[PDB]
Design a protein around this nucleic acid. Structure first.
Lengths: 136, 69, 51, 51, 398
RNA sequence: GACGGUGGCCAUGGAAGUCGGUAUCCGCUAAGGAGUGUGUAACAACUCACCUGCCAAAUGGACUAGCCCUGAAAAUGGAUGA
RNA sequence: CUAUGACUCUCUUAAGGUAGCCAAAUGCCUCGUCAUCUAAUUAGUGACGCGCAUGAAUGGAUCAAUGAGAUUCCCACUGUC
RNA sequence: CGCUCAUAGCGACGCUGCUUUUUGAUCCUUCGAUGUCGGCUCUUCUUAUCAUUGUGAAGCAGAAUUCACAAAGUGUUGGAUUGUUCACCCACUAACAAGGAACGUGAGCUGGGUUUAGACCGUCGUGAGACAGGUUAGUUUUACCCUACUGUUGUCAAUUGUUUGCGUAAUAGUAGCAUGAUUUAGUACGAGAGGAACUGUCAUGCCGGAUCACUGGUCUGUAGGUUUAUUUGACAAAAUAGUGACCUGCCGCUACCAUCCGUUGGAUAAUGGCUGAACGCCUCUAAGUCAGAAUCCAUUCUAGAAAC
């Protein structure tokens, strides 16, 4: 799932961390944390984490949030990777700290996206682009 | 590309090389060096190195002008 | 145009149901009269019924 | 409204109030026109279709 | 036991399995295309010299993309491309065993290549008077008769011929004490035509402008960096000593099983790191430059915007160990075999190809100048720094 | 060429040789089962059984056992000893 | 027998597991059942407990303080990966 | 059985087999000792092909499956739980297929179990003690030899000139594999609901070869600064602190923690035909031959023969 990239996949993979990394929910829904289970499309090989997306969809969970949203897996969307990258451009976007949002399995983000969102992510997921006034 | 201030330095971006940073507030911060970044994260005008010429002036042996203060 | 629920399709034309319950306010102040048309889209049902 | 969609661009510089930039994309399909007059205040369901 | 995974590729390609120290410190050739086009002006192969890399912005031409034209930095390899002088011809002969060097036919033109194939003859490892002309250099006036005699022979004998070419590098700063000879199999046109062309060449000394285009897919051949006696953890893509509690430095762990009861050839093992040939294919090239010396020195990129304010392309200073440019150049799209005293024997691709972004003609914008601690962006940053002060920074380090 | 009593009787608006079922008889002819299938809502049409024209002398089934093949896949490369 | 077996009757080898406690370091069947803890738990912990084969100085039950003690869970300075 | 219909797909009752990846039967070899189990590591191998490609079927309209063949070229995952294979859920995925190789791999590992001494509990035993009963703690030694292998010198003394260039290429190895979005197209297909392909286009996963323009990483560059303690009477400049610590930090080496690069011809397989007999017809076949796989072999690529 979902899947819709992009055109392209907005080029190479970069992560803040793979499996077992907290990033904030950045969402009006009362998920307060997002912890990764795994990432979609990772086919992977012998001993290698299923590694965080640059703006791609993930199997996640609400570890600390609303108890209703707590437990039960959730497809999400990575929004900003603390750990850095170069783009086809020659810039190195880098962030304060990791972040994403909990989302629908057609990609759609629920409420409104908080804070700054890398443009690649927006490009990937049109709903994301729609539901924010910050796309930097 | 195009020339731009690094937002914590007089040393401007050579339209080519360096880094970028967004932060929680959502802001442009282009950078060139890691030292600059460090300085930003501390919040201080440069005071553990000679490389930035702010320091050679206030130490003397380069910029022999204002000398004593 | 095409607001207040109305999804146009070529599939339907080819042959397709895609039923829906909607209504557009389509009044006309043409000349000296009124014309209460209103785009009624009754979904109905494919088999014989009360529905 | 949240400020800075673009970075070093002419969106925040202009800061449109429905002038030259937003006039475009209102002829092929009106982007965000409020088609059915959406719910400003909370739900109190008394809806019906009927004749 | 099953395995039990799946993947275990032989960490590493088996395709380079001898992994020796490759002999020829120029990209050794053993491969060219074939043709009979009236255009026989193509020779197949040049040889330049790497003297570092820089980077460049160029708006790219590949519609269908997320953006059809958009600024992007690409890295870029630059190589001093001096003159290829051609001291002789070598014919050949078609046969069962392969081909053969019956014997060469050298004209005259230059004799600097000679005192490189030398200073090694007789007792005490070496001497400096010739004991041998016994596989070597002929005369001049009483040389051309031989050529005339044998030209006709090679005209008739349909086996292909290559030119005994060589670059000039004592004209660079490097002062190479090794002989830098290279074959270039002439292609296109008749055998006779080819030999005539070769003959004509002896009267002249070609450069790369005639061989390749500004937009032209090369297959670089070089010698990679020879990184030394080195370990399996580092020689292949093998995951290491599983633990800290483990008892090895330099290991695989299993090396082939009781299985066929001797070790297998193909098993990850430490030796010395690839100093091989290899052939990086389809380097598109962005520019041939004009030669620096005797004007062209202050001209590597022309006009302001799209070529920008004038400059030399080169990376500044004499370098603590390394080379600085002084001749015409090739802007190969990123990376080549080895470091910066290393011969990139070039050849046009075997299967020259249309595709898409193999041929797409291409334009540039800003271009770098290297090292950030000590210098900045060439002439502009030179000026600003100077203005700021001459006690602080100017940007010239010998 | 491959007809008639005839849409035989049943079931069945209808299923007429042939959804399906039963009895399955005779006339005329060299020749034609109340019919092998295809097909038809079903009839028909075609095809078969069945008969003749031409070509012109061999043909058809059913088994039997000799060699060959199928069956007949497993792990370092590979053994009629080569 | 609505029944966990209070209670009666009998038999051996006298008595016949009381209070407690438990799939415990004691439970084979056994990954017991229910519950929680987890994205997922043969792990832990609460409960249940006709307990293969628990149990009262063979000492039973609990528990502050302590422990290079055994188990788990969370925060814990992320080259174990 | 499967509306109909034995064999599309299954297939009762019954028979013939293979297999040595279960375990038993066995005791031929080893008790003057093959280091027992598992997991990490890693190659190679077999096919009984999970995906892939090319195909043939279907109860195959489409998507989606199901069955068959050629085919081992390439792929075949991250966890939770358990000593653990076996097992048992979650999670992605093209697929998460089976196996072998002294039940591959202890002078490669840890030792989690099992297998000693100490102990605990239960049960059994008059007791010493027993328990495929649990529980807890319990030294993984030696390669400097021979070979095999990795890389490297040396030799090529009949590789023939006291010797040295530039070449050839036999032989060996060989590499790229795969996905997604988009176009096609909401078109074909389909009552509908749903819903494709050949080609093109842009990217990704893994893998393989390089590199360091950029960025990130590091520091004996002890290159500069900041600071502690100490010592050199102070200032200063230095030392000791076995690199004093800290912040920067070059060259350098390096990170799908960055970048660039990985082709095209014939030969076939299955299979689909063509002409076409044996067998007046008829038939992809017997003679003969067309197309045609990730295949085969070359091309390209590594090494370069007591080979020229």
């Amino acid at each position: 799932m979902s899947k819709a990239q992009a055109v392209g996949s907005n080029y190479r993979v970069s992560l803040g961390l793979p499996v077992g990394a907290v990033m904030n929910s950045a969402d009006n829904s009362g998920a307060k944390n997002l912890y990764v289970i795994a990432v979609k499309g990772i086919k992977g090989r012998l001993n290698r984490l299923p590694s965080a997306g640059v703006g791609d969809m993930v199997m996640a969970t609400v570890k600390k949030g609303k108890p209703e949203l707590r437990k039960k897996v959730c497809t999400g969307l990575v929004v900003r990777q603390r750990k850095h990258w170069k783009r086809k451009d020659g810039v190195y976007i880098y962030f304060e700290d990791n972040a994403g949002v909990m989302c629908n399995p057609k990609g759609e983000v629920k409420g409104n996206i908080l804070g700054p969102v890398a443009k690649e992510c927006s490009d990937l997921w049109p709903k994301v682009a729609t539901n924010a006034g910050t796309i930097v | 590309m195009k020339t731009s201030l690094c937002n914590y330095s007089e040393f401007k971006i050579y339209p080519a090389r360096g880094m970028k940073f967004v932060r929680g507030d959502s802001k442009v911060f282009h950078f060139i060096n890691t030292k600059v970044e460090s300085l930003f994260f501390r919040k201080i005008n440069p005071r553990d190195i000679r490389w930035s010429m702010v320091y050679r002036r206030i130490y003397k042996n380069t910029t022999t002008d204002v000398s004593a203060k | 145009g095409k607001l207040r629920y109305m999804d146009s399709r070529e599939d339907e034309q080819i042959r397709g149901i895609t039923m829906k319950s909607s209504a557009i306010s389509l009044h006309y102040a043409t000349g000296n009269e009124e014309y209460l048309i209103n785009l009624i889209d009754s979904p109905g049902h494919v088999d014989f019924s009360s529905e | 409204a949240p400020l800075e969609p673009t970075q070093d661009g002419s969106a925040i510089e202009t800061c449109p109030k429905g002038e030259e930039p937003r006039g475009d994309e209102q002829q092929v399909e009106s982007m965000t026109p409020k088609p059915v007059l959406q719910e400003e205040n909370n739900q109190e369901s008394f809806i019906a279709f009927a004749r | 036991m099953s395995h039990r995974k799946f993947e275990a590729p032989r960490h590493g390609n088996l395709g380079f399995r001898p992994r020796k120290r490759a002999a020829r410190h120029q990209g050794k050739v053993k491969s060219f295309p074939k043709d009979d086009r009236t255009q026989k002006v193509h020779l197949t192969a040049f040889m330049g010299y790497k003297a570092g890399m820089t980077h460049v912005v160029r708006d790219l031409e590949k519609p269908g993309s997320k953006m059809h034209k958009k600024e992007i930095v690409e890295a870029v390899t630059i190589i001093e491309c001096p003159p290829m002088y051609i001291v002789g011809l070598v014919g050949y002969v078609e046969t069962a065993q392969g081909l053969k060097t019956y014997k060469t036919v050298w004209a005259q033109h230059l004799s600097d290549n000679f005192r490189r194939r030398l200073y090694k003859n007789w007792y005490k490892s070496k001497s400096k008077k010739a004991f041998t002309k016994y596989v070597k250099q002929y005369e001049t006036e009483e040389g051309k008769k031989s050529i005339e005699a044998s030209l006709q022979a090679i005209k008739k004998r349909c086996s292909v011929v290559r030119v005994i070419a060589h670059t000039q590098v004592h004209k660079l700063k490097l002062t190479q004490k090794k002989a830098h000879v290279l074959e270039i199999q002439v292609n296109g046109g008749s055998i006779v035509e080819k030999v005539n062309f070769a003959v004509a060449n002896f009267e002249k000394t070609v450069n790369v402008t005639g061989v390749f285009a500004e937009n032209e897919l090369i297959d670089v051949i070089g010698v990679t960096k020879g990184k030394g006696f080195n370990g399996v953890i580092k020689r292949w893509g093998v995951r290491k000593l599983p633990r800290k509690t483990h008892k090895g430095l330099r290991k695989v762990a299993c090396i082939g099983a009781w299985h066929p009861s001797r070790v297998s050839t193909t098993v990850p093992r430490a030796g010395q790191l690839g100093y091989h040939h290899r052939v990086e294919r389809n380097k598109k090239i962005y520019r041939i430059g004009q030669a620096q010396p005797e004007d062209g020195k202050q001209i590597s990129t022309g006009k302001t915007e799209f070529d920008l304010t004038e400059k030399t392309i080169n990376p500044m200073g004499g370098f603590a160990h390394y080379g600085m440019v002084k001749h015409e150049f090739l802007m190969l799209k990123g990376c080549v075999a080895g470091p910066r005293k290393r011969a990139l024997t070039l050849r046009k691709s075997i299967t020259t190809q249309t595709g898409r972004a193999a041929l797409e003609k291409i334009t540039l914008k800003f271009i770098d100048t290297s090292s950030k601690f000590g210098h900045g962006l060439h002439q502009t940053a030179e000026d600003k720094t100077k203005y700021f002060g001459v006690k602080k920074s100017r940007s010239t380090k010998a």
